[PDB]
Design a protein around this ligand. Structure first.
Ligand SMILES: NC(=O)CN1C[C@H](O)[C@H]2C[C@@H]1Cc1c2[nH]c2ccccc12
Ligand SMILES: NC(=O)CN1C[C@H](O)[C@H]2C[C@@H]1Cc1c2[nH]c2ccccc12
Ligand SMILES: [Zn+2]
Ligand SMILES: [Zn+2]
Ligand SMILES: [Zn+2]
Ligand SMILES: [Zn+2]
Lengths: 360, 360
């Protein structure tokens, strides 16, 4: 069985399980079951399934070098699929709630879920809640007697929290920290002093890397019973590095990838985000370029957004991206080599994760 | 130590723990720590702490009849407090997100959290996410080696899901079920056929009773190591009964308690909610009263809201409330007696829970 086909089949299985359980235990009626089915499908399907598949791919690496009964190999791959769907559903929660928080219009070439006519924000906040609850229902049902359940739930819990923290860092990244105050509306930064590489790294580390790289890699180890084969400090370091690179790419694409390819009109400039482009621009600009940036950043007006996009082009940030890319290739290859000391198989999974990120 | 004083002290302890951990592990800065402190305080404190205190009160019942070392009694009461705060923080999550979903203005005589000038919906959705994440961080840290941790996490997980499901039932309770469709905007019911006692019971059971009564009672048993002393089907039945009664009271107060005492302008009539008053009115009204109800329910216009409030007064729903109250007293006393068979101590805790609900 090709891994994707298996992964997708298990989607249907898990869907049927959750909807059947809503009918047999939660007194749900068929129309609300259908609404939840459509919500699940709309919010969980249609991406690349990179996160979930990584769990599968890591478990597959281990199966290739381990002795198991056929039924045990099937159980491990099933677990990896269910674990991969937990992560996909966790992502789905975040995208639903983030699109509402940000007033986003499109996601993957279709309207954000809250914008569907029969959903609205009033339902969609709650639908996002249900998405994350489903992660836990999946785990407790499929993994009830599993030796890794404790460790998986504790990991998942910490990743989810880190992610929420990172969302706070992200949506506040254009405020001056000294002024943040629930009681007082926030004038956006005028100095941009907090647009630094270290601060940027903090935002990305928490908002993206834990759920996108750390969780799938570690979940793949846990469902394999393989965590003690690896140095967890190395997994953390490589996860944070690769996940940073992934987010820098995303930031560049926000600004420069045409909307049909992105699936979205990018609005990071209008949203004053602490993006890689803004931080890097500010790391090389002269006084006049800085002053023009400050006059135009963070504003819906398209003439102002264009001035920022021009500032970026003429700053030749492509060069900085290529230098950043070269440094990450060094560090990621170094980490892959260190991982080979205790697990060559896992190191290869990490190499695959890196290629799929690097090329896309 | 009076139980409240202990409960409140443990709030400070847990707060310090979560904020210190954000600084030592999550790279948080002091201004964002302060923002999270104020969010926690605003959203978690100021109510009656009925839910959390019930956990304490049930654990206290058991301590009174059990032999324990002093240090064990302190550990059980500390656990009960932390467990009680999990529930308080879970409630806080729901109120934050519900107030946003419903576009509510006030909560406990103060602006809803999303309405604070330095919060906004964009932050508040996420703050509500963090609230629920904190429940899990508390459990894993305080209960890491506890024999009940599995059972507590699984229970909490199921209650939270039931609650989310119940929120879906509540916000869709004015739609015709046959028309619910994510793709199509929802004309509210014209027939009110789904305003029935059974349907009403389904909404309240899921939206309120599991988190308000079932979870605190069962948590109190789990932290006491006392769950096998009791018939869980009876706990469920009494929880659902008392929690129904609590919600009927709430519904009556929405409509008839002046706003300064409620802490809120009630909007259930404008919001077309399936409330006890609407269902009960429809259970006794004549044709002309029904037709006048349908012409005015579910509309902001204050002349229309007054017509509905008059319809309710002149229908003498006070009589139906008194009859409903009498029946619940029978059933709750019956259940309390059945609970005495295996645990007289627990039955008394349930009697206390009932009195605090019945009188308030
Ligand atoms: N009328 C506007 O659209 C202004 N707009 C709002 C964007 O949300 C965004 C960027 C900007 C200012 C701002 C942003 N984010 C913040 C957080 C704190 C303090 C200021 C901001
Ligand atoms: N302009 C208004 O305020 C109309 N108002 C909106 C209230 O939210 C509410 C009651 C009503 C109709 C409605 C309600 N809820 C629903 C769910 C599905 C379908 C119709 C409704
Ligand atoms: Zn966002
Ligand atoms: Zn982006
Ligand atoms: Zn509500
Ligand atoms: Zn109410």
């Amino acid at each position: 069985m090709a891994s994707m086909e298996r992964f997708l089949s298990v989607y249907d299985e898990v869907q049927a399980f959750l909807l059947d359980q809503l009918q047999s235990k939660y007194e749900i009626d068929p129309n609300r079951a259908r609404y939840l089915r459509i919500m699940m499908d709309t919010t969980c399907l249609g991406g690349k399934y990179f996160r979930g598949m990584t769990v599968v791919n890591v478990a597959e690496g281990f199966l290739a070098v381990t002795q198991h009964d056929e039924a045990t190999k099937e159980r491990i791959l099933h677990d990896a699929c269910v674990g991969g769907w937990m992560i996909e559903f966790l992502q789905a929660h975040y995208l639903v709630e983030d699109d509402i928080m940000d007033g986003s219009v499109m996601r993957r070439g279709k309207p954000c879920w809250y914008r569907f006519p029969g959903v609205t924000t009033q339902c969609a906040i709650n639908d996002g809640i249900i998405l994350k609850s489903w992660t836990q229902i999946m785990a407790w049902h499929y993994f009830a007697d599993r030796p890794f359940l404790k460790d998986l739930l504790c990991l998942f819990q910490k990743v989810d929290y880190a992610t929420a923290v990172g969302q706070m860092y992200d949506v506040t990244s254009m405020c001056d920290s000294n002024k943040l105050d629930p009681e007082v509306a926030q004038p956006m930064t005028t100095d941009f002093a907090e647009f630094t590489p270290a601060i940027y790294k903090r935002i990305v580390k928490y908002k993206t890397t834990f759920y996108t790289y750390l969780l799938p890699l570690v979940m793949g180890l846990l469902v394999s019973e393989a965590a003690a084969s690896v140095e967890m400090n190395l997994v953390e370091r490589v996860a944070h590095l690769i996940g940073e690179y992934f987010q820098v790419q995303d930031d560049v694409m926000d600004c420069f990838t045409p909307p049909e390819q992105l699936g979205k009109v990018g609005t990071d400039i209008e949203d004053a985000k602490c993006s890689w482009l803004a931080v890097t621009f500010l790391g090389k600009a002269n006084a006049a370029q800085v002053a023009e940036f400050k006059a135009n950043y963070g504003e819906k007006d398209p003439a102002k957004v264009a001035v920022v996009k021009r500032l970026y082009s003429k700053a030749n940030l492509q060069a900085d991206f290529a230098a950043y890319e070269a440094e990450v290739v060094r560090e990621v290859e170094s980490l892959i080599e260190q991982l080979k000391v205790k697990s060559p198989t896992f190191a290869e999974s990490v190499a695959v994760v890196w290629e799929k990120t690097h090329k896309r």
